[PDB]
Paper text:
The cation diffusion facilitator (CDF) protein family, a conserved family of transmembrane transporters found in all domains of life, ensures divalent transition metal cation homeostasis at the cellular level. CDF proteins usually form homodimers and share a conserved structure containing a transmembrane domain (TMD) with six transmembrane α-helices and a cytoplasmic N-terminus. Most CDF family members also have a relatively large cytoplasmic C-terminal domain (CTD), which adopts a metallochaperone-like fold and has been suggested to have a regulatory role in the transport mechanism. In the model strain Magnetospirillum gryphiswaldense MSR-1 and related MTB, this behavior is based on the formation of magnetosomes, unique sub-cellular organelles that are composed of nanometer-sized crystals of the magnetic mineral magnetite (Fe3O4) surrounded by a lipid bilayer membrane. It was recently proposed that the magnetosome membrane-associated protein MamM is a CDF protein that acts as a magnetosome-directed iron transporter, as its deletion or single point mutations within its CTD abolished magnetite biomineralization.
However, a large number of the MSAs showed that L349 in ZnT-10 is homologous to M250 in MamM. To ensure that the MamM CTD can serve as a reliable model that will allow us to gain better knowledge of the disease-causing mutation in ZnT-10, we performed in vitro studies of MamM CTD M250L, as a representative of wild-type (WT) ZnT-10. Calculated running averages at the productive stage indicate that WT and M250L systems stabilized after 3 to 5 ns of simulations. First, we analyzed MamM CTD WT and M250L, which both yielded SAXS Kratky plots similar to a folded lysozyme plot, which was previously used as a globular-protein control. MamM CTD WT and M250L spectra are very similar and show high content of α-helices, in agreement with their crystal structures. Accordingly, all the in vitro experiments with MamM CTD M250P showed that the proline substitution causes severe structural changes while the M250L mutant preserved the WT CTD structure.
Residue numbers in the entry:
A (entry chain A), B (entry chain A): 212 to 291
Write the structure that this text describes.
């Protein structure tokens, strides 16, 4: 599938960002030629809530920078 | 509405739990006579991710303990 290549690129890009302890969940869909995606990342339980927010914002920048067709990306965090 | 009384009870119960800095979002719906609800609470940005998780679990217990018709409640947290 065209989509599985894209999903591989999101996961790979997310996992390279400092503080990411793996991708817990990824759901991606096409809206025309654009991708909209929902991503959940793992983070250190001892990080602050503010740190987990910064890591999500860094994941969003890194993913959207690498995958140009992404036009909406939501990133949240869970302790792992 | 029957629902607005219930929504008032969820918000009130959530806000009385230690570490809750207000209810950011509440969406509740009936599935037959049962309530299913999605709640977002505010928390101190300097709490740990583990602390924010404990506060959500305490909100879930407190809300479900006070409002017997709730059969599904999801609680997440945001810095505020």
């Amino acid at each position: 599938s065209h989509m599985e290549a894209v999903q591989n690129r999101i996961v790979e890009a997310a996992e390279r960002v400092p503080g990411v302890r793996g991708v817990i969940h990824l759901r991606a869909r096409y809206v025309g030629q654009d991708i909209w995606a929902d991503l959940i990342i793992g983070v250190d339980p001892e990080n602050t809530v503010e740190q987990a927010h910064e890591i999500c914002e860094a994941v969003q920048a890194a993913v959207c920078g690498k995958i140009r067709r992404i036009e909406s990306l939501h990133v949240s965090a869970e302790a792992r």
